[PDB]
């Protein structure tokens, strides 16, 4: 058996073909087992509609998840990603730095 804690990155991207659009991204990388729970948060509340959830693996024991959706952030709002995994005794919350 092997288990590996996910690395978690939270960042925003504008698709170059539609630059007014903005996407909040949680990239959860290098984890095993693949069982996982991932949410985007707005002011601490789960965002129910997340339009993209893309799972892959490299080696049979290394999984990657890109969890992302369109958003419209204001300077006062706080966004984050919350991850639950067997390796994480408490849910891990990684805040969006709004300059990322």
Curated annotation (Swiss-Prot):
One of its GO terms (cellular component) is MHC class I peptide loading complex. The modification Pyrrolidone carboxylic acid is found at residue 3. Disulfide bonds join 26-81. It is found in: Secreted; Cell surface. GO terms for biological process: amyloid fibril formation; antigen processing and presentation of endogenous peptide antigen via MHC class I; antigen processing and presentation of exogenous peptide antigen via MHC class II; antigen processing and presentation of exogenous protein antigen via MHC class Ib, TAP-dependent; cellular response to iron ion; cellular response to iron(III) ion; cellular response to nicotine; intracellular iron ion homeostasis. Heterodimer of an alpha chain and a beta chain. Beta-2-microglobulin is the beta-chain of major histocompatibility complex class I molecules. Polymers of beta 2-microglobulin can be found in tissues from patients on long-term hemodialysis. B2M alone (not in complex with HLA-I) interacts with M.tuberculosis EsxA (ESAT-6) and an EsxA-EsxB (CFP-10) complex; the tripartite complex can be detected in the host endoplasmic reticulum. The B2M-EsxA complex can be detected in patients with pleural tuberculosis and is stable from pH 4.0 to 8.0 and in the presence of 2M NaCl. Belongs to the beta-2-microglobulin family. It is linked to Immunodeficiency 43: A disorder characterized by marked reduction in serum concentrations of immunoglobulins and albumin, and hypoproteinemia due to hypercatabolism. Patients may suffer from recurrent respiratory tract infections and severe skin disease. This is Beta-2-microglobulin. It comes from Homo sapiens. The lineage of its organism: Eukaryota, Metazoa, Chordata, Craniata, Vertebrata. The chain holds residues 21 to 119 of 119 of the full protein.
């Amino acid at each position: 058996m092997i288990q590996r804690t996910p690395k978690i990155q939270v960042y925003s991207r504008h698709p170059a073909e539609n630059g007014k659009s903005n996407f909040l991204n949680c990239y959860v990388s290098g984890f095993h087992p693949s069982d996982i729970e991932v949410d985007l948060l707005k002011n601490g509340e789960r965002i129910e509609k997340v339009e993209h959830s893309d799972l892959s693996f490299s080696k049979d024991w290394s999984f990657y998840l890109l969890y992302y959706t369109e958003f419209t952030p204001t300077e006062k709002e706080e966004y984050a990603c919350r991850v639950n995994h067997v390796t994480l005794s408490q849910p891990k919350i990684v805040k969006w730095d709004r300059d990322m």
